[PDB]
Design a protein around this ligand. Structure first.
Ligand SMILES: [Ca+2]
Ligand SMILES: [Ca+2]
Ligand SMILES: [Ca+2]
Ligand SMILES: [Ca+2]
Ligand SMILES: [Cl-]
Ligand SMILES: [Cl-]
Ligand code: NA
Ligand code: NA
Length: 120
């Protein structure tokens, strides 16, 4: 004789998991982001510290999201944004990459941060 645990008053599977009856026991089909025999674990997607460079990790349902510290980008904030990519230095100035910052080394005779000032 078998008792259907799923048909009973309450659902033994936590977090809206699907209850599937078996002979002798029961099993839980968990939703994305939940684990355990009764879906009682909210999987920590931030447990392995996936966010890099002092970024903040958000433990979400079935996913993680990284809030990047200024100057960094990407899903894991792994990319140090190249501020020289957009070519900010006018009149062909040398660009030096920093954090959320660029450094223009202006040609002769220009100045100073974007090399826009013509000294004539
Ligand atoms: Ca059963
Ligand atoms: Ca989670
Ligand atoms: Ca940078
Ligand atoms: Ca600047
Ligand atoms: Cl992210
Ligand atoms: Cl300037
Ligand atoms: Na981008
Ligand atoms: Na300038």
């Amino acid at each position: 004789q078998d008792v259907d645990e799923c048909s009973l008053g309450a659902n033994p599977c936590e977090h809206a998991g699907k209850c599937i009856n078996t002979l002798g026991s029961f099993e839980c089909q968990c939703l994305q982001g939940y684990t355990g025999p009764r879906c009682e674990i909210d999987v920590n997607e931030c447990v392995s510290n996936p966010c890099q460079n002092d970024a903040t990790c958000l433990d979400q349902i079935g996913e993680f999201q990284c809030i990047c510290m200024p100057g960094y980008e990407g899903v894991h904030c792994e990319v140090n944004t190249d501020e020289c990519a957009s070519s900010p230095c006018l009149h062909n100035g040398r660009c030096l990459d920093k954090i959320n910052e660029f450094q223009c080394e202006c040609p002769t005779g220009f100045t100073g941060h974007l090399c826009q000032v013509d000294l004539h």
